[model samples]
Target chain A: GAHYFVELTEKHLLAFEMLNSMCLLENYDHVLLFLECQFGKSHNLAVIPFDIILVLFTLSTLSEYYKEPILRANDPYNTSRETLSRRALKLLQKYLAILKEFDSEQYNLYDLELLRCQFFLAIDTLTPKKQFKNPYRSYISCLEQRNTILGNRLLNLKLNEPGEFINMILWTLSNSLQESTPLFLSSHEIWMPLLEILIDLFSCRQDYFIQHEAQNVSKSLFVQRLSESPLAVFFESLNTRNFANRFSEYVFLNCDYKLPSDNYATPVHPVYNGENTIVDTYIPTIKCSPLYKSQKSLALRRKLIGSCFKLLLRVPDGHRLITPRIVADDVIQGISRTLASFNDILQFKKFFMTENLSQESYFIPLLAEGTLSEILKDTQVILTLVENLSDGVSFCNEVIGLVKSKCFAFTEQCSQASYEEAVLNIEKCDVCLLVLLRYLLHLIGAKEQLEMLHAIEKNDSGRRQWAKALNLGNDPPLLYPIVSQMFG
Target chain B: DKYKDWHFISKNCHYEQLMDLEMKDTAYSFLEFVHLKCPSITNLLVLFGVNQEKLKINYEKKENSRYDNLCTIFPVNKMLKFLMYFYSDDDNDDVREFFLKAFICLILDRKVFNAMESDHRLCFKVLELFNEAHFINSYFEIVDKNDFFLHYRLLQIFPHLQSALLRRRFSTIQQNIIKEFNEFFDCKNYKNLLYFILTMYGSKFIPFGPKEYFKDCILDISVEISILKGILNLFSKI
Candidate 1:
């Protein structure tokens, strides 16, 4: 009975498409999803096309729904969200091939997006896949097309399910990064847009999610999703070892950042297909890091790096393989020719060099907050150089300058005691710690690090690693006293 | 308990086989090994497929690419000759670096490197590359060795090689290192040589000071050392 009514409504499809196909196309997946509210009786009526499934799924809505006998059917027995969850998840594996064959009708992007969202909705009925959240606009658009409306149950999939929203969005990003079979998987032009959105979303105040009762996002789902995320995927891809080597080489060569708004930061592979297919396909290549594009507005570079540093904190134990952690390798590899600015280096030190104290101090290093001795496990043999040594000298000198300047900024707002007095202020501990650690890193160079690593090798590897790691420069250099006072 | 951090890198049995091939000092290039050994392999396998499951099944049936063309196109001896003494008037650093990296990859076998360091052959290889030629000079350029300098030569590997000597085991590894330094007087740019040698001298950890043997070598070391001046050293000279 409900299918007959849904069929009666299909007559309006042509009239609606002319009005704006995107609105109608997405809303159909949007409207049909509500059928799962009472999603049982129509199980036998399944196995439909994109439109057919929506029609039956929509019918399942009204048979128990409408006040009219036309919609009311002989459906009985009280069922819950779980019953349809099984049925809905089954529909999950269905209809994907329909898209493989999806050609004209020339289905629009959102149409395919809508169908994928329906799969999420089906799984969502089981309390499951995040695609339903993607129709992103589907919930608000009026599928009724200005007819009498039924009382709406806008699921508001995100607002009510903040934790789920965080996981799904992050995992989907992981999915996109992991999806490539080619060398230039990162070559997709839209990746930066996804990156920009996730970064901005994380930077948003937590009160927006927890209504001010909580101070921070406690969700580990974000980390779980991100460990396999683009954030870590290229750096820590569990797959092959070659990409990490090549990708890291590319990073130090450029030693750079890639952002969402600025076109393509990754160099598009000159030849895409190894088996030898034609490929003069549209691809953009970049010479500088994505951070380079923003140099005209200098602070945006710091903020972007800072934003990246913020995301880098969520990674496990602050992996050195990731972009933010590899500045040393990048600078050393390129011999400081790749190194650009004093400020960019400071931001990296500020975020990564400090130990994590918990999310509160974690964010301390937000205004605050936090690459690679591991590579060239042996070039460290070849890793030596004069220019890098001098650049490191400049880096250590600049760390002192950075510490004084940070002392000026944070302490001036609270104490008029000035750089000398405030230099030892507890308030500026993070600032000092950052400088001390970076200065200390400069002293140890990966070359010297391995020396101590050999020292600790004869000692207990783990405890000695932690112990001798601190003793690498034979105890911290000139600034250690300041760190001792403030850090203690 | 020398830091065995290489367990992660040695995980690939295929890499082990390749490293073994290099340890034996083979005639063919790596690509030829891939072809002569594996009749059927993958694209990535030729470069990095690194078959872990195969173990060392190759003592009987194992042998394992541009390396395919490179080895086939030219004999290993000529290529080594070419790589050791390349010259390009057209001159591109990238081209030079490409050639440099090309051979470096050929010699990149870790086990052979361990052999070089273990028997002190690798350290001596750096010494040979150091005391030797103008290979890095062809397409490479380093200016302002005037104020002071350390890089831009085949010998750039020297300090690092010296670092390889410090804190390492096997009396053979250290035995020749001291011998190498005594032989260093024959090397170029005396004070400049001391730049790296002094860095190496500081690199090692000595817990309690000298022994009687240390005292004997100390005066002898001073007696053997010598430097006349070099023209490049006007600014660096004290």
Candidate 2:
């Protein structure tokens, strides 16, 4: 197996140490001939004795000499240290290319297992520590170039034969994304791609053998394994709520599928002891569309949403639910605020006042329409689920109180008379009232629900007009009798 | 067309029966129907472990003839939702295999692939499907040989491929791309060259043979450290 003149014995090890010593003494290009001899055309990575281990050793040696931080006063090109770094990057990139080639050709990975396991650790340990604000963009790019090469192979290994090394690959990828971490996340450009890799690996494990094994016990166990992945841990550590909310709006308005009129779908009820038991499991279908505006933001948004929901779904009996650690109301409130923030964008004045409105403006109106429809749909599903679960006595008064208060606030806002001036104004009021009303109707009886509705209707002459407008519609038939009676 | 109608009728029949005691079936059909239409129902039938062999035979026959019309009309999310539903740990190898086969058929269809290649928006949608479906290897098969934006978008969508060289027949994929690059350069579209060079640097493509030529071609540029950083990676030889 040894193609080179010397065997990969103590002699080569001693020679490597000597080269490192020489290189450390400021003798630039001290290891140039050594590197060339090792990686030169005939004696390429393959057939080289101790290929994987020696590659890491060489990478370490190069990193020690070449990767000095470039201070502001120092012209990076003017220094031998920077030159050494450039050459090291070039060689690292070359080695990565060769390793990838080897993998793609279906070469043996048994020997390279150790190499793959500690590959990121070595890179992270050796790369220069980036300082505040002044990111090492060039170095980061070079490292990313190498990391990407290995990422393919790692993905291959995880997907093809995911036995022992799955944890190693995941942990290495996980550590790289940690704040103040190594090898990745040094700059903004790399995070999305790195996140995508995480997303792909986490989602793709459904096909792996481990998942297949878990399926024999229970589907929940398989999902549990997925949620327990180190990648999921990293996702939990991610500061996602604000990011999720801000971009969720964009995803909702743009990338997500339009809310189909009847898109609510629940899981099959299992016959437990011959009595049908409701499954909390559900799947919401979003119409997928490409966002013309803020495409990058949309991708990030989707990544955040996918990860957040996956984290929730991986728990036992966690299907169709968010994580129990966080208050559902708080999460919903944050999402609700995000959903509400669109009011500025969806305001009716922008449509008629502005010529050549941005596509975002058009999307805003469409989204406003869609959200109102979706709000009703979501409310209906939640109401139905609660109704099924209810003994007609165990209703959560807090939830009902929240619903009542939200309705009162919305009605109060609508009663201010400025809301009735324009159809769009009335439309926004209707959306808010409907969301709150739908929630309240499910919480209390129709009597209470109607009393609340009439409370607002009796408060002002504006309400009289709103009520009159409601009566003027078989259009949507505002409230069906069957639905109102559930609360009654 | 008559067969398509039967497919719809069968789906509706299943839905109607599913609505009562088999409520789960209703939910499944509701979710599936939201994203897919007639042809996709047959695809779902395949995914749910029904008549896979027959469906596959029908898919093969229909794909080559009526594919343009046979493709499902669903947004990317709905497509993804449907795919994810069946992509579970269950021992339904029949369902998984059939699903993959069906997806490959849909992806490779002339109308769909061309639609994706020609439009960036459509390309993004398809990319989501590919990414979520974990169809990375099959994904390479559909790349347009000549379009620069598509190639750029492809790399953007899957960044891991940035370091990976083109695999198998994909090495030949870039020959036409290289010619286009040369033509773009010939027209004094230096910016296009710059863009192509940057993408090549990031993606690190390995020419099947004459590997050294791409090295020389990239390095022949005027010397600058940043520019060299882009081309330095192209010199990797096996």
Candidate 3:
């Protein structure tokens, strides 16, 4: 009980009797005014730290004033607090209305930021527990009030400075998270909006970077915390159409590798062991982890999945999006097509290698096709090829990050652990990409395998390989087994 | 009534206010009616062709509810119209059963021949609507075939319909459809393939002609009737 001594604020103590009388009378207006005055004065003081005893006292007082006590008190002075609360609410409304009078978009952006800060300050200052007759103590009520004010502002205005808005909100939230425990689980409400803002920023990164505009430098913001954001979970909560919209907006809108560099200088790929290799140390300014690159690349891959998403949404169920469900044929064809093109056309040798290349130029495609064509049907052959390609794409991305940073590069020179960095990156971008690509290939292969199995003479070897490759055995397949099982 | 002004809607209320518009005509406000209703129809021409998965599902579902609440508001005429349409595709067993049940309900309800329109041709117009429904499945089953025959068996359902004239017209349509079917299969499995071939070949859907097709669907017994016939014959021979 003596904990009350340290916790009682000057205003809370001064108004204690008045607050008690207000609560006895259900005087809300009096209660709000007195509390506002208390907070208003407290704001002027330079950070008076509340000890545990003080915090507990404050919490107790808040609990007492919570609506239950006020209603139980059922007296007139308490009524004044009620009236005061009403007036303050009205005042808040008027403040918002006055804000509407300003028409400029830039001003509105700043105005909203200001409003959010003020609202946050109000919430921080007030004890949510109904103590000494101040009402509105429930966490949900407080959260809803804040959600309404900011949510409307967000829904109404498409602020040009989406990056700043998101960053400010995140920074403020991160600060609050450090300072105190959340009033509730929705303390994480900011995460969803932050994800949306980052998504917008990423989509608009190219334009902003090109234009040298306010939101242009936002890709770097994600470079810091992109993996940690549970954006996909948030996206999944929306309706099908909204999910598609978010998918398209996130994936298709702006897809380019964006990194922030002030020097306008790109580090040349260091020639190591006669191969152009990128060392983690050589690009210190990049703020990159192997994981970061992995995540970033994976993000690109997930975004690339739009191609398949759009295709599947167009096709039939229990069917693959691939033409004729011919996995072997498709993979072989795809391999051929991929190899058909030359690399680094900037070099004459590269151009020469690609020049006059017949379809038969690549021995693997023909050899693999010929060997498999007779042994395995077109569909089974393709299933193997796709599975391998998917694995290859994923493995290449992961090991590259690992080999360069963790195992291959000198430890002291490396900025951070490649495994951690790559894992993180995989979580964000490259992993999503690998998963999406793998899923798409699996779906294509499954469809082909299904059609082939049903169509021609079934081979024991082909079925075993198909099952193994697709990961559809007793252990269950890796890439979205649902599609595979459904196809089967 | 909700949309007091049409220039713009208040924020967060787009769905709510749009739902409040009771009159379909009033709701058709794109600032240009002709653009929506009378545009080149090229975009809608696609609706006439092949089965789009979503659209096909929607159309099939819509099929179940076509008669809907119309029977209560306009009973006699509606019942008569439905009966006539039912008889129009008697050859298809599934369609015939559905329509036959509906017609029986109408007769039992003592509402037969209640439609104000005495013209049997008007009844056939409703039949056309049913026929125009987009196909969901790749092929019509034997049940559907029987339904078509059922419709053919009864002309009293459309009392004033000119049977001989319609028959000539139908025969011409059938010949055109069979001609295409022959081309699709190259008359390979000419007899057993007739119904199946007609389902695919005679369809106003599926853009690929037999020659234009790329992949030789390995399982598509569409390529070999002789194999199926031989297998059956071999079993019988044994």
Candidate 4:
């Protein structure tokens, strides 16, 4: 009974062993024909043992691998081996198609484990090899189409259950990112869908991510895996359009962890749809985690600022003045929120210090022009935050001092006409010096110390006069008292 | 009725109700004749003379609203047509000044140019005024001396008018005005001029055809290498 094909007694080990030997060497083509007769005709994949499928997959991989050398040879009958390899690919695709349609609940835990092994094995074998050939091109194309089909199917199954679906996606993507060492998934087919799927989830399935079930250990686990990976650097290196923008928004805007509030001990549960769904659920409280302190995350934050500036740099004057108003607002708020959430003032200072300071094309134009304040509307927030921190006042002074030096340097670098043009450009938006004056006034109230006001006061008057001459209107009231010498 | 000297001469029309009424009466009476007479070029020049006399009488008076009054009282269509045809060598300055004031009033009324789209004639005429550099530079006195937005608006309209010119090849005068603009790229107040130029270059509103032409013009100008390089650097961004 154990040796029989259809056994009344329960034992197929001997029959499978006989077939496995046949598949390994002695006429594997007949073995494939035997399996096709049994499984392909009925279209029932559940009856097949995982061992048989594994044997077929291995034979298919070996067949393709061995065919390359035969093709390189001048053998006349090598075309038959090519035909055999093509048939092996056809059988593998057919098996995968049937397997894709199998009911998830019908499989036991063991069955599911085997299925996972099967799918990942297919992915491994089907991945593009180092060499390119016309025959293999269509094979890889078929492989990609099957994987995309698989990805789409998985996405739809968890269409309503975000936590379950996200967990699976994270689990899948984490593997690819971790395996990429220093580089990333170079295949557009793989990473594009991964990115597009995440954006889709964030934009449409936002409620699932926001719901209680998605919050807890799931979030922490995802964060831990993400932190351990070099996903941030991978994102920053992408020169493709809108990839960095979309991914950065997902990280900074969608992620829930934030800097510690001074008075706040308890977490704030933000109101959503007039409902109190706030809990210790969706957000990973990783503000104090080791991953948060990793060098990768810091570089990510800095790159986030760079990406935000790319959009802000394009705004023009006149009818198109601040033409990208909506996009600019989003980028601005993203920067403010990210910068505001830094753990301490030193971390914030370190972020700016690491940038290429001497690069005129990158840093100087941003500083000399009024790009930052035009977007960073609430400079007051940073001012107050800095003053409250130890030595924050000195830090603020140092930054302002740096900006003033750069401002003068800009004048020295250009012709008188060019310098005037630079000045004109700066007037379109409030200058950095103006923000510095406001910072000082906030620390020492305009009425509290006249001496403190006078220091920046002399500097402020020269700029304000220039501003007025350029028709920039009155000084921002925060600095009005200091420069105008008016009482509150 | 009471009598007062023209506001400019006697400088005491502040109390002269008849003089004010007579100016207003004559201005309105001229408007009525303008529609009736459909004034010829010489007749329009004559009308411009009387208007200029009235404007001179009203100039430098703080409380005078005669500039606005003349704008509403004048026949704008007929005046624009006359100005289009009125080219005389000896009397050119007077016609130019009248056109400048009329242009200013039209801008002040916010009826001169379409904000969302370009008005071709209005854009071309503005360039023509730039051809007479004195008018454009003088505009700053009446407007803000450092009105960068106005300069931006002018440059922004330039590409549209330029494209229309190249397409039709209609006016040698307009073509010359474009040449004049290319030269102005090197002029002083480079900051204001460069800012608008950069703004225009970066905009998608300007087609690549005219934009390529504009880039060549900017490159051909004589300026400090750094400034030229800086302006050229802006092209890379576009």
lDDT of 2 at A127: 16
List where candidate 3 sits over 4 angstroms from the true fold. A1-166, A169-180, A183-187, A190-447, A451-483, B1-238
Question: Please, what are the lDDT tens digits per residue for candidate 4 over residues B88-194?
Answer: 43566766666555444333321222211111354356547444345444442222222333444443334333233222221334454355345456566554454
Candidate 2 vs 3: which has more DockQ: 2
Once superposed on the true structure, which residue ranges of model 2 sit more than 4 Å away at CA?
A1-194, A205-213, A218-227, A238-295, A314-337, A346-417, A420-488, B1-237
> How close is each model in CA RMSD to the real structure?
32.6, 21.3, 33.0, 31.3
On the 0 to 100 scale, the lDDT of residue B50 in model 2 is: 30
Q: Which pairs in model 2 have colliding backbones?
A: A257-A287, A268-B24, A288-B77, A445-A487, A446-A487, A446-A488
Ranking, TM-score, top scorer first: 2, 4, 1, 3
- Summing lDDT over every window of 10 consecutive residues in candidate 3 chain A, give the lowest-scoring window: A344-353
Q: How many angstroms is residue A51 displaced in model 1 relative to the true structure, after the best TM-score fit?
A: 18
Kindly list the per-residue Cα lDDT of model 3 for residues B16-124, writing each as its tens digit. 2222221222112100222343232222221211112111112233321222121211223322432352254437666554443333323221123221222234445
TM-score for the first chain in candidate 2 comes to: 0.32
How do the candidates rank by lDDT, highest first? 2, 4, 1, 3
Superior candidate under TM-score, 1 versus 4? 4
* Candidate 4 clashing pairs, residues 3+ apart or interchain: A215-A281, A215-A282, A216-A281, A421-B191, B2-B18
For candidate 4, give the DockQ: 0.01
lDDT of 1 at A428: 33
User: Local error of candidate 3 at A58, Å?
Assistant: 26
lDDT (Cα, tens digit) per residue for candidate 3, span A308-386: 2322232333333222122222333332222222121111111111212232122322423232233222111122432
Tens-place lDDT per residue, model 2, A256-275, is 23333232222222111111
